[PDB]
Design an enzyme around this catalytic site. Structure first.
Site, mmCIF file in Angstrom:
data_model
loop_
_atom_site.group_PDB
_atom_site.id
_atom_site.type_symbol
_atom_site.label_atom_id
_atom_site.label_comp_id
_atom_site.label_asym_id
_atom_site.label_seq_id
_atom_site.Cartn_x
_atom_site.Cartn_y
_atom_site.Cartn_z
ATOM 1 C CD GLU B 11 -3.048 -1.014 0.256
ATOM 2 O OE1 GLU B 11 -3.035 -0.049 -0.536
ATOM 3 O OE2 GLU B 11 -3.951 -1.880 0.255
ATOM 4 C CG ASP B 20 -6.421 4.315 -5.322
ATOM 5 O OD1 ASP B 20 -6.893 4.980 -6.268
ATOM 6 O OD2 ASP B 20 -7.115 3.548 -4.622
ATOM 7 C CG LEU B 32 -11.400 4.054 -0.326
ATOM 8 C CD1 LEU B 32 -10.673 4.723 -1.476
ATOM 9 C CD2 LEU B 32 -12.285 2.919 -0.828
ATOM 10 C CG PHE B 104 -5.815 -3.848 4.501
ATOM 11 C CD1 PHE B 104 -5.380 -2.932 3.558
ATOM 12 C CD2 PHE B 104 -5.828 -3.473 5.834
ATOM 13 C CE1 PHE B 104 -4.978 -1.661 3.936
ATOM 14 C CE2 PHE B 104 -5.427 -2.207 6.217
ATOM 15 C CZ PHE B 104 -5.001 -1.299 5.266
#
Ligand SMILES: [Cl-]
Ligand SMILES: [Cl-]
Ligand SMILES: [Cl-]
Lengths: 162, 162
Positions: B11, B20, B32, B104
Protein backbone atom coordinates in the site's frame (compact mmCIF):
# COMPACT_ATOMS: atom_id res chain seq x y z
CA UNK A 1 -43.64 -1.29 -10.15
CA UNK A 2 -41.56 -2.30 -7.12
CA UNK A 3 -38.07 -3.35 -6.02
CA UNK A 4 -38.72 -6.94 -7.09
CA UNK A 5 -39.94 -6.10 -10.59
CA UNK A 6 -37.17 -3.49 -10.79
CA UNK A 7 -34.33 -5.91 -10.08
CA UNK A 8 -35.85 -8.56 -12.34
CA UNK A 9 -35.54 -6.12 -15.24
CA UNK A 10 -31.91 -5.38 -14.34
CA UNK A 11 -30.86 -8.92 -13.40
CA UNK A 12 -33.25 -11.05 -15.45
CA UNK A 13 -34.66 -14.44 -14.45
CA UNK A 14 -32.87 -17.66 -15.33
CA UNK A 15 -33.50 -21.04 -13.71
CA UNK A 16 -30.18 -22.59 -14.77
CA UNK A 17 -26.66 -21.66 -13.70
CA UNK A 18 -25.25 -19.21 -16.22
CA UNK A 19 -22.27 -16.89 -16.64
CA UNK A 20 -23.12 -13.18 -16.44
CA UNK A 21 -21.49 -10.46 -18.54
CA UNK A 22 -18.36 -10.68 -16.37
CA UNK A 23 -18.20 -14.47 -16.65
CA UNK A 24 -19.37 -15.13 -13.08
CA UNK A 25 -21.66 -18.08 -12.34
CA UNK A 26 -25.14 -16.78 -11.53
CA UNK A 27 -28.66 -18.16 -11.10
CA UNK A 28 -32.21 -16.99 -10.47
CA UNK A 29 -32.55 -13.21 -10.27
CA UNK A 30 -29.02 -11.87 -10.04
CA UNK A 31 -27.77 -14.31 -7.39
CA UNK A 32 -23.99 -14.57 -7.62
CA UNK A 33 -23.03 -18.15 -6.79
CA UNK A 34 -19.26 -17.65 -6.90
CA UNK A 35 -16.48 -15.63 -8.52
CA UNK A 36 -14.55 -18.87 -8.97
CA UNK A 37 -13.91 -20.16 -12.50
CA UNK A 38 -15.38 -23.49 -11.38
CA UNK A 39 -18.74 -25.04 -12.23
CA UNK A 40 -18.37 -27.46 -9.31
CA UNK A 41 -18.02 -24.49 -6.96
CA UNK A 42 -21.06 -22.90 -8.58
CA UNK A 43 -23.16 -26.05 -8.19
CA UNK A 44 -21.84 -26.62 -4.67
CA UNK A 45 -22.86 -23.15 -3.51
CA UNK A 46 -26.21 -23.60 -5.27
CA UNK A 47 -27.06 -26.77 -3.33
CA UNK A 48 -26.22 -25.08 -0.02
CA UNK A 49 -28.24 -21.97 -0.92
CA UNK A 50 -31.36 -23.94 -1.89
CA UNK A 51 -31.00 -26.83 0.55
CA UNK A 52 -31.17 -29.71 -1.92
CA UNK A 53 -29.29 -31.42 -4.76
CA UNK A 54 -30.11 -29.05 -7.61
CA UNK A 55 -27.59 -29.97 -10.32
CA UNK A 56 -27.44 -26.35 -11.47
CA UNK A 57 -31.22 -26.13 -11.87
CA UNK A 58 -33.86 -24.55 -9.62
CA UNK A 59 -37.59 -23.89 -9.92
CA UNK A 60 -39.44 -20.58 -10.27
CA UNK A 61 -40.52 -20.63 -6.62
CA UNK A 62 -37.00 -21.48 -5.46
CA UNK A 63 -35.64 -18.61 -7.54
CA UNK A 64 -38.18 -16.19 -6.09
CA UNK A 65 -37.45 -17.39 -2.56
CA UNK A 66 -33.71 -16.90 -3.01
CA UNK A 67 -34.41 -13.52 -4.59
CA UNK A 68 -36.39 -12.41 -1.54
CA UNK A 69 -33.42 -13.45 0.59
CA UNK A 70 -30.97 -11.41 -1.48
CA UNK A 71 -33.21 -8.34 -1.26
CA UNK A 72 -33.42 -8.76 2.52
CA UNK A 73 -29.63 -9.01 2.66
CA UNK A 74 -29.33 -5.82 0.62
CA UNK A 75 -31.64 -3.89 2.94
CA UNK A 76 -29.78 -5.22 5.99
CA UNK A 77 -26.53 -4.17 4.33
CA UNK A 78 -27.90 -0.64 4.11
CA UNK A 79 -29.33 -0.50 7.63
CA UNK A 80 -26.15 -1.82 9.28
CA UNK A 81 -24.01 0.78 7.50
CA UNK A 82 -23.37 4.18 9.08
CA UNK A 83 -23.08 5.90 5.70
CA UNK A 84 -25.95 4.20 3.85
CA UNK A 85 -28.58 4.12 6.60
CA UNK A 86 -29.18 7.85 7.13
CA UNK A 87 -29.44 8.32 3.37
CA UNK A 88 -31.91 5.44 3.06
CA UNK A 89 -33.97 6.78 5.98
CA UNK A 90 -34.28 10.15 4.25
CA UNK A 91 -35.25 8.77 0.84
CA UNK A 92 -38.79 8.23 -0.42
CA UNK A 93 -40.16 4.80 -1.36
CA UNK A 94 -39.10 4.94 -5.02
CA UNK A 95 -35.59 6.30 -4.41
CA UNK A 96 -35.02 3.71 -1.68
CA UNK A 97 -35.42 1.02 -4.35
CA UNK A 98 -32.62 2.65 -6.35
CA UNK A 99 -30.31 2.48 -3.34
CA UNK A 100 -31.34 -1.12 -2.63
CA UNK A 101 -30.67 -1.87 -6.31
CA UNK A 102 -27.10 -0.57 -6.01
CA UNK A 103 -26.39 -2.60 -2.86
CA UNK A 104 -27.96 -5.66 -4.49
CA UNK A 105 -25.50 -5.28 -7.35
CA UNK A 106 -22.17 -4.41 -5.68
CA UNK A 107 -22.80 -4.94 -1.96
CA UNK A 108 -22.74 -2.73 1.14
CA UNK A 109 -19.15 -1.50 1.25
CA UNK A 110 -19.05 -0.78 -2.48
CA UNK A 111 -21.92 1.69 -2.41
CA UNK A 112 -20.84 3.22 0.91
CA UNK A 113 -17.73 4.48 -0.89
CA UNK A 114 -19.75 7.05 -2.85
CA UNK A 115 -19.61 9.39 0.14
CA UNK A 116 -20.13 12.64 -1.75
CA UNK A 117 -23.08 11.40 -3.83
CA UNK A 118 -24.60 9.90 -0.68
CA UNK A 119 -24.49 13.30 1.02
CA UNK A 120 -26.14 14.88 -2.02
CA UNK A 121 -28.97 12.34 -1.94
CA UNK A 122 -29.58 12.94 1.77
CA UNK A 123 -29.55 16.67 1.00
CA UNK A 124 -32.04 16.00 -1.82
CA UNK A 125 -29.64 17.34 -4.46
CA UNK A 126 -30.76 14.80 -7.04
CA UNK A 127 -29.08 16.23 -10.14
CA UNK A 128 -25.72 16.67 -8.39
CA UNK A 129 -25.87 13.07 -7.17
CA UNK A 130 -26.81 11.87 -10.66
CA UNK A 131 -23.86 13.69 -12.22
CA UNK A 132 -21.36 12.41 -9.65
CA UNK A 133 -22.47 8.77 -9.72
CA UNK A 134 -22.02 8.89 -13.50
CA UNK A 135 -18.28 9.46 -12.98
CA UNK A 136 -17.89 6.15 -11.13
CA UNK A 137 -16.42 2.86 -12.32
CA UNK A 138 -19.84 1.38 -11.52
CA UNK A 139 -21.36 3.46 -14.31
CA UNK A 140 -18.44 2.47 -16.54
CA UNK A 141 -18.91 -1.24 -15.82
CA UNK A 142 -22.71 -1.28 -16.21
CA UNK A 143 -23.82 2.00 -17.88
CA UNK A 144 -27.28 0.88 -19.06
CA UNK A 145 -28.23 -0.21 -15.55
CA UNK A 146 -26.55 2.79 -13.94
CA UNK A 147 -28.56 5.13 -16.15
CA UNK A 148 -31.83 3.54 -15.03
CA UNK A 149 -30.82 3.67 -11.36
CA UNK A 150 -29.47 7.22 -11.61
CA UNK A 151 -32.59 8.37 -13.47
CA UNK A 152 -34.66 6.86 -10.66
CA UNK A 153 -32.61 8.86 -8.16
CA UNK A 154 -33.10 11.99 -10.25
CA UNK A 155 -36.83 11.78 -11.02
CA UNK A 156 -38.01 9.78 -8.02
CA UNK A 157 -40.28 7.90 -10.42
CA UNK A 158 -40.36 4.56 -12.27
CA UNK A 159 -40.02 6.11 -15.74
CA UNK A 160 -36.73 4.30 -16.35
CA UNK A 161 -38.43 0.93 -15.72
CA UNK A 162 -41.84 1.79 -17.25
CA UNK B 1 8.20 -9.33 8.25
CA UNK B 2 4.57 -9.14 9.38
CA UNK B 3 1.11 -8.02 8.21
CA UNK B 4 1.93 -4.39 8.98
CA UNK B 5 5.24 -4.45 7.10
CA UNK B 6 3.60 -6.54 4.37
CA UNK B 7 0.88 -3.98 3.72
CA UNK B 8 3.33 -1.09 4.12
CA UNK B 9 5.01 -2.55 1.04
CA UNK B 10 1.84 -3.20 -0.97
CA UNK B 11 0.00 0.00 0.00
CA UNK B 12 2.89 2.34 0.77
CA UNK B 13 2.99 5.06 3.42
CA UNK B 14 1.86 8.62 2.70
CA UNK B 15 1.00 11.35 5.18
CA UNK B 16 -0.87 13.47 2.62
CA UNK B 17 -4.00 12.69 0.61
CA UNK B 18 -3.25 11.16 -2.79
CA UNK B 19 -4.98 9.27 -5.59
CA UNK B 20 -4.24 5.54 -5.78
CA UNK B 21 -3.74 3.69 -9.07
CA UNK B 22 -7.53 3.64 -9.51
CA UNK B 23 -7.78 7.39 -8.88
CA UNK B 24 -9.41 7.09 -5.45
CA UNK B 25 -8.38 9.46 -2.66
CA UNK B 26 -6.26 7.54 -0.15
CA UNK B 27 -4.04 8.36 2.83
CA UNK B 28 -1.79 6.72 5.42
CA UNK B 29 -1.34 3.03 4.64
CA UNK B 30 -3.93 2.12 2.02
CA UNK B 31 -6.77 3.82 3.89
CA UNK B 32 -9.54 4.59 1.41
CA UNK B 33 -11.15 7.94 2.22
CA UNK B 34 -13.74 7.95 -0.56
CA UNK B 35 -14.43 6.85 -4.13
CA UNK B 36 -15.91 10.29 -4.84
CA UNK B 37 -14.00 12.52 -7.30
CA UNK B 38 -13.91 15.37 -4.78
CA UNK B 39 -10.86 16.47 -2.81
CA UNK B 40 -13.07 18.39 -0.39
CA UNK B 41 -15.04 15.21 0.27
CA UNK B 42 -11.75 13.37 0.80
CA UNK B 43 -10.58 16.02 3.28
CA UNK B 44 -13.97 16.00 4.99
CA UNK B 45 -13.83 12.23 5.49
CA UNK B 46 -10.27 12.49 6.78
CA UNK B 47 -11.21 15.06 9.43
CA UNK B 48 -13.94 12.67 10.57
CA UNK B 49 -11.53 9.72 10.61
CA UNK B 50 -8.93 11.52 12.73
CA UNK B 51 -11.20 13.87 14.67
CA UNK B 52 -9.39 17.10 13.85
CA UNK B 53 -8.96 19.60 11.03
CA UNK B 54 -6.19 17.96 9.01
CA UNK B 55 -6.43 19.74 5.65
CA UNK B 56 -5.41 16.48 3.99
CA UNK B 57 -2.34 15.86 6.16
CA UNK B 58 -1.87 13.43 9.07
CA UNK B 59 0.97 12.45 11.40
CA UNK B 60 2.83 9.14 11.42
CA UNK B 61 1.27 8.10 14.74
CA UNK B 62 -2.13 8.98 13.27
CA UNK B 63 -1.45 6.86 10.19
CA UNK B 64 -0.32 3.95 12.37
CA UNK B 65 -3.38 4.26 14.61
CA UNK B 66 -5.64 4.43 11.56
CA UNK B 67 -3.78 1.53 9.96
CA UNK B 68 -4.16 -0.64 13.06
CA UNK B 69 -7.91 0.06 12.96
CA UNK B 70 -8.13 -0.99 9.30
CA UNK B 71 -6.24 -4.23 9.99
CA UNK B 72 -8.55 -5.00 12.93
CA UNK B 73 -11.55 -4.33 10.69
CA UNK B 74 -10.13 -6.74 8.11
CA UNK B 75 -9.57 -9.43 10.74
CA UNK B 76 -13.04 -8.91 12.20
CA UNK B 77 -14.45 -9.18 8.69
CA UNK B 78 -12.72 -12.53 8.29
CA UNK B 79 -13.83 -13.96 11.64
CA UNK B 80 -17.46 -12.89 11.15
CA UNK B 81 -17.60 -14.47 7.68
CA UNK B 82 -18.56 -18.15 7.43
CA UNK B 83 -16.40 -18.65 4.32
CA UNK B 84 -13.30 -16.83 5.59
CA UNK B 85 -13.15 -17.79 9.28
CA UNK B 86 -12.57 -21.55 8.91
CA UNK B 87 -9.91 -20.92 6.25
CA UNK B 88 -8.18 -18.25 8.35
CA UNK B 89 -8.19 -20.47 11.45
CA UNK B 90 -6.56 -23.36 9.57
CA UNK B 91 -3.78 -21.26 8.03
CA UNK B 92 -0.25 -20.68 9.31
CA UNK B 93 0.89 -17.27 10.55
CA UNK B 94 2.25 -16.17 7.16
CA UNK B 95 -0.62 -17.32 4.93
CA UNK B 96 -2.96 -15.59 7.39
CA UNK B 97 -1.31 -12.30 6.47
CA UNK B 98 -1.93 -13.07 2.80
CA UNK B 99 -5.63 -13.51 3.52
CA UNK B 100 -5.74 -10.37 5.67
CA UNK B 101 -3.94 -8.53 2.87
CA UNK B 102 -6.66 -9.51 0.40
CA UNK B 103 -9.52 -8.56 2.74
CA UNK B 104 -7.69 -5.32 3.58
CA UNK B 105 -7.60 -4.54 -0.15
CA UNK B 106 -11.02 -5.60 -1.50
CA UNK B 107 -13.03 -6.19 1.68
CA UNK B 108 -14.75 -9.18 3.29
CA UNK B 109 -17.45 -9.86 0.69
CA UNK B 110 -15.00 -9.55 -2.20
CA UNK B 111 -12.62 -12.22 -0.92
CA UNK B 112 -15.47 -14.45 0.24
CA UNK B 113 -16.50 -14.75 -3.41
CA UNK B 114 -13.38 -16.80 -4.17
CA UNK B 115 -15.22 -19.84 -2.86
CA UNK B 116 -13.17 -22.43 -4.74
CA UNK B 117 -9.74 -20.99 -3.90
CA UNK B 118 -10.83 -20.68 -0.27
CA UNK B 119 -11.67 -24.39 -0.21
CA UNK B 120 -8.29 -25.22 -1.74
CA UNK B 121 -6.48 -23.11 0.86
CA UNK B 122 -8.33 -24.85 3.68
CA UNK B 123 -7.38 -28.19 2.12
CA UNK B 124 -3.76 -26.98 1.83
CA UNK B 125 -3.90 -27.34 -1.96
CA UNK B 126 -1.77 -24.26 -2.48
CA UNK B 127 -0.94 -24.67 -6.17
CA UNK B 128 -4.58 -25.11 -7.16
CA UNK B 129 -5.56 -22.00 -5.18
CA UNK B 130 -2.83 -20.01 -6.94
CA UNK B 131 -4.09 -21.11 -10.37
CA UNK B 132 -7.68 -20.04 -9.65
CA UNK B 133 -6.69 -16.75 -8.01
CA UNK B 134 -4.47 -15.96 -11.00
CA UNK B 135 -7.62 -15.95 -13.15
CA UNK B 136 -9.37 -13.27 -11.08
CA UNK B 137 -10.06 -9.66 -12.02
CA UNK B 138 -8.10 -8.80 -8.87
CA UNK B 139 -5.05 -10.40 -10.48
CA UNK B 140 -5.64 -8.42 -13.68
CA UNK B 141 -6.07 -5.03 -11.99
CA UNK B 142 -3.25 -5.27 -9.43
CA UNK B 143 -0.97 -8.04 -10.79
CA UNK B 144 2.25 -7.20 -8.91
CA UNK B 145 0.53 -7.18 -5.53
CA UNK B 146 -1.57 -10.23 -6.41
CA UNK B 147 1.51 -12.14 -7.58
CA UNK B 148 3.24 -11.51 -4.24
CA UNK B 149 0.15 -12.56 -2.27
CA UNK B 150 -0.32 -15.66 -4.43
CA UNK B 151 3.34 -16.63 -4.02
CA UNK B 152 2.89 -16.22 -0.26
CA UNK B 153 -0.04 -18.65 -0.43
CA UNK B 154 2.07 -21.14 -2.39
CA UNK B 155 5.12 -21.12 -0.11
CA UNK B 156 3.88 -19.87 3.25
CA UNK B 157 7.06 -17.80 3.50
CA UNK B 158 7.96 -14.10 3.24
CA UNK B 159 10.44 -14.57 0.40
CA UNK B 160 8.26 -12.65 -2.08
CA UNK B 161 8.50 -9.57 0.17
CA UNK B 162 12.25 -9.64 0.84
CL1 LIG C 1 -11.55 -18.72 -6.84
CL1 LIG D 1 -19.61 9.97 -5.40
CL1 LIG E 1 -11.87 -10.23 -8.26
Amino acid sequence: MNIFEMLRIDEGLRLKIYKDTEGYYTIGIGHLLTKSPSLNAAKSELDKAIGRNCNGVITKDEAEKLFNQDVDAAVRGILRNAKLKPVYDSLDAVRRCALINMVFQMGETGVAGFTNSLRMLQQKRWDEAAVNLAKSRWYNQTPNRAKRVITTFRTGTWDAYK
